[PDB]
Design a protein around this motif. Structure first.
Motif, PDB file in Angstrom:
ATOM      1  N   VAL C  19       4.159  23.607   1.776  1.00 29.79           N
ATOM      2  CA  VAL C  19       3.228  23.046   3.053  1.00 29.79           C
ATOM      3  C   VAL C  19       2.430  24.395   3.382  1.00 29.79           C
ATOM      4  O   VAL C  19       1.004  24.305   3.844  1.00 29.79           O
ATOM      5  CB  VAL C  19       3.977  22.828   4.225  1.00 29.79           C
ATOM      6  N   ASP C 153       4.034  -8.199   6.019  1.00 29.26           N
ATOM      7  CA  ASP C 153       4.465  -9.398   4.985  1.00 29.26           C
ATOM      8  C   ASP C 153       5.857  -9.876   4.970  1.00 29.26           C
ATOM      9  O   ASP C 153       6.157 -10.929   4.667  1.00 29.26           O
ATOM     10  CB  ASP C 153       3.958  -8.891   3.644  1.00 29.26           C
ATOM     11  N   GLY C 154       6.653  -8.974   5.518  1.00 25.27           N
ATOM     12  CA  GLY C 154       8.068  -9.053   5.504  1.00 25.27           C
ATOM     13  C   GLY C 154       8.439 -10.114   6.722  1.00 25.27           C
ATOM     14  O   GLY C 154       8.191 -11.368   6.490  1.00 25.27           O
ATOM     15  N   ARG C 162      -1.940 -15.293  11.100  1.00 26.52           N
ATOM     16  CA  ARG C 162      -2.631 -15.813   9.880  1.00 26.52           C
ATOM     17  C   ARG C 162      -4.100 -15.840   9.864  1.00 26.52           C
ATOM     18  O   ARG C 162      -4.604 -16.830   9.863  1.00 26.52           O
ATOM     19  CB  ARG C 162      -2.001 -17.216   9.715  1.00 26.52           C
ATOM     20  N   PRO C 299     -29.140 -15.644  17.892  1.00 29.54           N
ATOM     21  CA  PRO C 299     -28.012 -15.161  17.562  1.00 29.54           C
ATOM     22  C   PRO C 299     -28.248 -14.425  15.879  1.00 29.54           C
ATOM     23  O   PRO C 299     -27.851 -14.633  14.853  1.00 29.54           O
ATOM     24  CB  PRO C 299     -27.571 -16.546  16.632  1.00 29.54           C
TER      25      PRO C 299
ATOM     26  N   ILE D  52      -2.422 -18.385   4.080  1.00 26.01           N
ATOM     27  CA  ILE D  52      -2.050 -16.928   4.319  1.00 26.01           C
ATOM     28  C   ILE D  52      -0.599 -16.642   4.601  1.00 26.01           C
ATOM     29  O   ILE D  52       0.008 -15.542   3.936  1.00 26.01           O
ATOM     30  CB  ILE D  52      -2.790 -16.386   5.570  1.00 26.01           C
ATOM     31  N   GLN D  56       1.964 -14.113   2.663  1.00 28.90           N
ATOM     32  CA  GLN D  56       2.949 -13.125   2.999  1.00 28.90           C
ATOM     33  C   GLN D  56       4.412 -13.398   2.437  1.00 28.90           C
ATOM     34  O   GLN D  56       4.958 -12.393   2.004  1.00 28.90           O
ATOM     35  CB  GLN D  56       2.894 -13.541   4.483  1.00 28.90           C
ATOM     36  N   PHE D  60       6.354 -10.606   0.494  1.00 30.50           N
ATOM     37  CA  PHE D  60       7.726 -10.216   0.745  1.00 30.50           C
ATOM     38  C   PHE D  60       8.641 -10.213  -0.631  1.00 30.50           C
ATOM     39  O   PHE D  60       9.481  -9.243  -0.769  1.00 30.50           O
ATOM     40  CB  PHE D  60       8.304 -10.932   1.787  1.00 30.50           C
TER      41      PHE D  60
END
Lengths: 93, 36, 442, 288, 86, 195, 96, 103, 93, 86
Positions: C19, C153-154, C162, C299, D52, D56, D60
């Motif tokens: 370091v 993701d877990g 989503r 827009p 989606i 996921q 996992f």
């Protein structure tokens, strides 16, 4: 693992030598010449002890965490230890 | 055949320590400077 | 010395030395360019974005996406984050890796502890920056990669919603931990330990999410679901609504930007050509919307929002019609409705110069950058310069207010990286302060 | 994709993108949106969200794989096969289930949660086996620090603890293929541990043996050792003999297998005899 | 406090007695001079004269001793030097 | 020689223990039999500490920072207070018959232990729990309660308590290690006092 | 837990949310005074040393022991009554 | 010499004002975990049991203390609960936890 | 002038005190309490003598350039000079 | 290194040598043990053995000396004990 890191460190242009002093001034590993290896181990052993005493004298419930001494020629760092510490010398320039 | 490679084998801490031990013990035996 | 029980000290000593050496490495009005284009792992990848920092004012990140052509026969993830510094010699300093498309990237504002990014598919990731190099696949010629995160993701939850993400930003509003209450079962401080800032993530649906977790005391493996590292999770969650005034009937957002001064305030822009204001704590302070002196809808599909990095809280935004507005926080209408040069094309990137004068930069589709210096001139661009190696992808202005410097880093669709320094404009500084006050007063 | 790489196959990626742009642009432009478009547009959102979360879950699982495939433990490999069976049987059900999202996604939410739960359990079991793995490693690094000339009991204890821990795992319902792979590799680890200490002994046999006492006097007026010199020589040789015979009786993990994995070290380190016997003779000269 | 022997030219029995005697002297007295006086007098009586004792926290010495009658040790931070000469 | 509030009447100011603050020779607390701790500098007095109403059997001065002043008596409750204003800082709610001794060490971080009239000796790490003993030292199955507790001023991790027999037992304790950060306990108590 | 945040618990919203917890406490509070009642009944005579409770003031008479002993019982039982009243809002649980 | 002292203060000021701030927030290596002592195991018990043998059979401990100077010196005093107004009731028992105090 | 720069340093969030050691370990200026004023001045005087000697011993043609001591409690920095050094203490937290 | 003699059982000429020897020792040697050794050796040479020397800042002693061969003095803040015994 540790040997590979030491080699990688030594390869850095800043590093001028590394000494692993184990038994209170008795080294086992060095990347330096013998006279310097022995002298450096001894000096840093005495020097770090003085710093640790200084800290305890400032406050009787604190020890050394790290010690750095700088000079024109090179710079030396040591860390506190239970059994032994390691010596690194680099050129700050 | 001695297979010093030990290829069909794996370990992380066991092999690291063994490398360390090998170097430290080998140098110690040289330093003993035995005349034998 | 034979025992690993002591070799641990040798490891720690090496870690300190490494370091310190890394810290030691942090040394130092027209075209004067520099290149840092080593390709140790970028041989085939294409640049997609740039992002600068605030903790290290000489640091920049560059996103790269690998094509189907594999420069290396190894299993090579197609999405990496290249981390390097302006003053360092050729060669990236670090790299992060993920599985799916990465975007919506930002850094930690207090110190380099975490790196954040939003995934294309709506999940959130964060890498541990303050970690030694170990337990990562290395390569010769040495260079070592780094992959470590526990993504959303877990463990399944709702915070993902989503829905693809649009932007993330570190929200420096942590002012809690006034005290651990004397009766521990009711102490709220404990759950805030190590939490110095939150991270926000806005999705297309117009749903804003904020959370952060920090924790150091850990070991290689945990009983709970995680990666096989020592990293925090995402248990915390807060959700905030948006598009109440705006909302077939279902509307979305495009961009969000928070207020550096009080990060609790923020604005959100939508495709319908409007930008709303809001905050986090008191949701009735000034629930107004920003609009130019126009009628109907227009827009214009606002796509870039920024903030002037100076005392007066003025937000800026640009749209696909090549227009920019200065949406002063204390006004519903902008101060200076400028139509940029080459309005025939869109805004592709905005930024404020990290310099004392309020210099503003715009990049367009034709890769012609236009610069304003409203402290010394009118609304006309004070300078401009196009490039022959056109098809620019990204830029970022990087500098530091005292030693000082000023640079601009760019990247091309061809996959090259560029940077130059024109610090003569760093500051007068005396004239800049004189005109700065003048512009504010008038 | 039988390579530990799960992938979601989205069919109508176009329909989603089109409809999203469709309603967004018609609204912004002040255009009428036909009923047909709004119905499918709302449906399209349902498909996007579900696609989606499916990604996921796959991500996992893929993460779990990357953690597991580094050790290739037959236990987790078999559990992973059972996980894949869930996917494969579920795929077969697609004959009726391929339109769940279209009609009522709620069934799919339960679907993915149940599949995810199976993966989560797999991830948990894997870390537990890693915990055991580390435990065994912790032992071996201790075992390679046992003095063969003093601490024979430590090998006896260590080996028994290794076997005990291995049997303990088996008691949790494991397949022989798993323990088979384990014992082979961990036996080799013991081999390394033993050979190192074996080599150490070979170099210092003249230093680390239990001391022998002898009395020097004048038997018949002739200077002689009691016990005689030739006798203590024989004892010294027996002492080293016992040591070098150690790599013959070593019930390492998986004792049902071969033992030569260990004893091969004798021939492989037969060069050490030269130093041993040279030092032995020098010691005898010193006594003389 | 904790006794640490650094050097000794002395039998094992006398070594332990030197420490024990200094330990008792340190328990009874605060003044180093008086601690030394106790240690010296006890040794002259038990092991014949002539002993000398120096007790302190900061000193260097260079002395000559009779073989088997010298010890240098610490009790905590206080060093005790005891020997025979004459 | 004289602290008497309304002398020559129902005024018999007796106490069972006195503790003195290391901060200043002239600050101390008197463990009155009446039950309400009395601050005296001798006779002058300033605060009556109403949170603790039972006859006092033990007092202790505050360790460093001069805010954690202990009183304990028939109440069975260890009330800490700060002499600066005499508020109820906190009351340990041991459901035990009596208390006979308390253990403080100004040398160590702000930690607490005490010997209770049941035989148990409780330890409390302020940064972990308030009412729940962290470490607890027990007697044998049928030993009558400990009646005294004291700790060696020369720390050396030597604690001593006395059983209902004529025997004093020494424990070597390791739990109370030093650390940087425990100071937080002082700020937590000062903030609780002021609200 | 209830004592420290009693001002909030007494609020109609929170009181209902914690209904199960308040009734649980009530049952335990009943258990508490039940035990105190039995301990009193089995000791009120003051015959064994334990029933009286040794004190340094024993040198006057057993009166000092009874006073302190009962004092503790009174405070404990009284406190439990007031806490139940404040928290339960006079449910059948409290009536009993 | 005030201007000479000031000159020195200027030189060091230039060094410290820059060096200190750079180091203070350097946020360098934070893995330092050194104890200088073996980890102690769970709290031990019955380290020493000092008492007067005969007298301890009937007495109970009521007052204990340590000698701040002789940390080895542990003091104890037992007595009977009753009759403390008239007769000699007990003795003061001290024992050292010092060299050779094996009993 | 220098009085303002010393106050400026003292105002820094890290700095917990400044001691100007002049007469061989006896200071003349301090922003700290008296016990600390003498404690740090004396101890650091002894130490810097050791550190400067250490440099001369490890190499006979160099003097001290700087020293840093770190501890759990606080951190102390000193620089050498012709006549006297200065002590600054910071809170690393 | 100013010399102040506190106690002596020594001739005036030997007292001078004691101060002069210690003065040179302190000028030449930085380490306490080495200062002591210098002083001791100079006396063994000129006044025959066996001399003993203690040099330090914090100690007490109780020693036995040969008549007329004892001095105790300071050089600055450092005490020197110099005597013959044996």
């Amino acid at each position: 693992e540790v040997e590979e890191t030491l080699k990688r460190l030594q390869s850095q242009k800043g590093v001028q030598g590394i000494i692993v002093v184990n038994t209170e001034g008795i080294p086992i590993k060095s990347t330096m010449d013998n006279p310097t290896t022995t002298q450096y181990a001894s000096l840093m052993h005495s020097f770090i002890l003085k710093a640790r005493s200084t800290v305890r004298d400032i406050d009787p419930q604190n020890d050394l965490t790290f010690l750095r001494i700088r000079s024109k020629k090179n710079e030396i760092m040591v860390a506190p230890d239970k059994d032994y510490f390691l010596i690194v010398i680099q050129n700050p320039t | 055949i001695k297979d010093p490679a030990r290829d069909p084998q794996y370990a992380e801490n066991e092999v690291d320590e063994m490398r360390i031990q090998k170097d430290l013990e080998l140098e110690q035996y040289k330093r003993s400077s035995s005349k034998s | 010395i034979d025992t690993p029980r002591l070799c641990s000290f040798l490891r720690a000593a090496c870690q300190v030395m490494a370091v310190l050496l890394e810290e030691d490495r942090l040394a130092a009005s027209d075209s004067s360019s520099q290149l840092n284009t080593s390709l140790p792992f970028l041989q085939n990848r294409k640049v997609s974005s740039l992002h600068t920092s605030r903790v290290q004012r000489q640091m920049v990140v560059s996103v790269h996406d690998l094509p189907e052509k594999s420069f290396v026969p190894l299993l090579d993830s197609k999405y990496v984050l290249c981390v390097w510094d302006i003053w360092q010699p050729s060669g990236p300093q670090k790299v992060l890796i993920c599985e799916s498309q990465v975007t919506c990237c930002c850094l930690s504002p207090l110190k380099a502890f975490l790196l954040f990014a939003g995934t294309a598919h709506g999940s959130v990731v964060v890498w541990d920056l303050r970690e030694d190099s170990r337990l990562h696949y290395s390569v010769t010629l040495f260079w070592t990669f780094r992959t470590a995160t526990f993504s959303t993701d877990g463990i399944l939850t709702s915070v993902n919603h989503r829905s693809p993400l649009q932007a993330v930003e570190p929200i420096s509003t942590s002012v809690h931990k006034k005290q651990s209450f004397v009766l521990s079962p009711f102490s709220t401080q404990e759950e805030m330990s190590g939490l110095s800032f939150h991270i926000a993530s806005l999705d297309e649906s117009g749903v804003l999410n904020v959370w952060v977790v920090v924790e150091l005391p850990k070991a290689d493996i945990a009983g709970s679901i995680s990666d096989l590292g020592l990293m925090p999770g995402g248990r915390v969650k807060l959700v905030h609504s948006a598009l109440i005034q705006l909302g077939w009937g279902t509307t979305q957002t495009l961009n969000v930007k928070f207020l550096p001064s009080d990060p609790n305030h923020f604005i959100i822009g939508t495709d319908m050509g409007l930008i709303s204001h809001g905050t986090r704590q008191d949701l009735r302070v000034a629930p107004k919307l920003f609009k130019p002196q126009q009628h109907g809808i227009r827009p214009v599909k606002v796509n870039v929002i920024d903030f002037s990095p100076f005392g007066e809280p003025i937000f800026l935004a640009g749209c696909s019609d090549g227009s920019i507005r200065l949406h002063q926080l204390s006004s519903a209408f902008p101060l200076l409705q400028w139509d940029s040069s080459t309005d025939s094309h869109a805004v592709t990137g905005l930024q404020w110069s990290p310099t004392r004068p309020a210099v503003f930069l715009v990049q367009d589709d034709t890769s012609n950058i236009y610069i304003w210096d409203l402290l010394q001139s009118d609304l006309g661009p004070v300078a401009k310069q196009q490039v022959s190696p056109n098809r620019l992808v990204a830029m970022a202005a990087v500098g530091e207010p005292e030693g000082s410097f000023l640079a601009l880093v760019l990247a091309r669709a061809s996959g090259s990286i560029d940077i130059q320094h024109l610090k003569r404009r760093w500051a007068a500084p005396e004239v800049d302060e004189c005109n700065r006050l003048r512009l504010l007063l008038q | 994709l039988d390579s530990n790489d799960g992938l979601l196959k989205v069919h109508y990626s176009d329909r989603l993108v089109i409809l999203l742009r469709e309603v967004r642009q018609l609204s912004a432009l002040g255009f009428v949106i036909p009923a047909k478009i709004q119905q499918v547009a709302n449906i399209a959102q349902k498909f996007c969200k579900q696609a989606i979360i499916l990604k996921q879950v796959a991500h996992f699982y893929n993460s779990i794989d990357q953690q597991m495939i580094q050790s290739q433990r037959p236990m987790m490999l078999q559990s992973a096969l059972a996980f894949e069976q869930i996917i494969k049987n579920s795929k077969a059900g697609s004959g009726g289930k391929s339109q769940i999202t279209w009609d009522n996604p709620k069934e799919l939410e339960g679907y993915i949660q149940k599949l995810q739960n199976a993966a989560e359990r797999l991830a948990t079991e894997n870390r537990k086996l890693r915990k055991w793995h580390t435990t065994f490693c912790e032992k071996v690094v201790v075992l390679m620090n046992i003095d063969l000339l003093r601490q024979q009991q430590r090998w006896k204890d260590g080996l028994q603890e290794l076997r005990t821990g291995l049997a303990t795992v088996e008691a949790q319902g494991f397949q022989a293929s798993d323990m088979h792979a384990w014992k082979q590799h961990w036996n080799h680890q013991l081999y390394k541990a033993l050979e190192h200490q074996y080599q150490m002994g070979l170099e210092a046999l003249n230093e680390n043996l239990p001391e022998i006492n002898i009395d020097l006097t004048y038997k018949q007026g002739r200077l002689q050792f009691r016990p005689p010199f030739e006798e203590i020589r024989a004892k010294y040789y027996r002492e080293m003999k016992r040591f070098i015979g150690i790599p013959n009786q070593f019930k390492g993990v998986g004792e049902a297998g071969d033992e030569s994995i260990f004893s091969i070290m004798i021939d492989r380190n037969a060069s050490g005899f030269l130093t041993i016997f040279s030092k032995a003779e020098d010691l005898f000269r010193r006594l003389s | 406090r904790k006794a640490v022997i650094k050097n000794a030219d002395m039998s094992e029995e006398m070594q332990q007695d030197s420490v024990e005697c200094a330990t008792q002297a340190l328990e009874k007295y605060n003044i180093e001079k008086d601690i030394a006086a106790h240690i010296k007098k006890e040794f002259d009586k038990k092991y014949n004269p002539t002993w000398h004792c120096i007790v302190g926290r900061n000193f260097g010495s260079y002395v000559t001793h009779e073989t088997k009658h010298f010890i240098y040790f610490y009790l905590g931070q206080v060093a005790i030097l005891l020997f025979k000469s004459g | 020689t004289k602290l008497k509030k309304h002398p020559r009447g129902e005024t018999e100011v007796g106490a069972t223990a006195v503790a003195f603050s290391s901060f200043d020779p002239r600050l101390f607390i008197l463990g009155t039999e009446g039950g309400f701790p009395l601050k005296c500098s001798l006779a002058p007095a300033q605060f009556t500490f109403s949170p603790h109403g039972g006859p006092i059997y033990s007092v202790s001065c505050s360790p460093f920072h001069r805010n954690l002043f202990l009183s304990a008596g028939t109440d069975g409750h260890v009330h800490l207070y700060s002499m600066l204003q005499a508020p109820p800082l906190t009351s340990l709610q041991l459901s035990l018959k009596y208390l006979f001794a308390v253990r403080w060490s100004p040398v160590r971080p702000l930690v607490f232990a005490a010997a209770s009239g049941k035989g148990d000796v409780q330890l409390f790490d302020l940064q972990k729990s308030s009412q729940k003993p962290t470490v607890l030292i027990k007697q044998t199955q049928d030993e009558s309660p400990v009646y005294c507790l004291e700790f060696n001023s020369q720390q050396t991790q030597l604690l001593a308590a006395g059983d209902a027999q004529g025997t004093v037992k020494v424990w070597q304790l390791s739990t109370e290690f030093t650390e940087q950060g425990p100071r937080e306990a002082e700020d937590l108590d000062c903030l609780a006092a002021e609200v | 837990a209830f004592l420290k945040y009693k001002e909030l618990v007494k609020r109609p919203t929170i009181s209902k949310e914690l209904m199960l917890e308040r009734e649980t406490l009530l049952a335990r509070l009943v258990d508490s005074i039940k035990d105190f009642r039995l301990d009193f009944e089995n000791r009120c005579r003051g015959i064994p040393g334990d029933a009286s409770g040794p004190l340094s003031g024993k040198n006057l008479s057993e009166v000092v022991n009874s006073i302190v002993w009962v004092r503790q019982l009174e405070l404990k039982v009284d406190d439990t009554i007031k806490i139940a009243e404040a928290l339960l809002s006079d449910l059948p649980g409290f009536r009993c | 010499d005030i201007p000479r002292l000031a000159a020195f203060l200027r030189r060091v000021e230039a060094m410290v004002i820059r060096e200190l701030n750079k180091n203070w927030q350097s946020h360098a290596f934070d893995g330092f975990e050194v104890n200088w002592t073996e980890q102690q195991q769970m709290v031990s018990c019955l380290y020493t049991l000092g008492y007067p043998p005969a007298q301890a059979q009937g007495l109970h401990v009521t007052s204990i203390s340590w000698n701040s100077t002789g940390s080895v010196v542990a003091c104890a005093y037992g007595r009977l609960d009753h009759g403390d107004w008239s007769t000699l009731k007990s003795f003061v028992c001290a024992w050292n936890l010092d060299r050779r105090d094996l009993r």
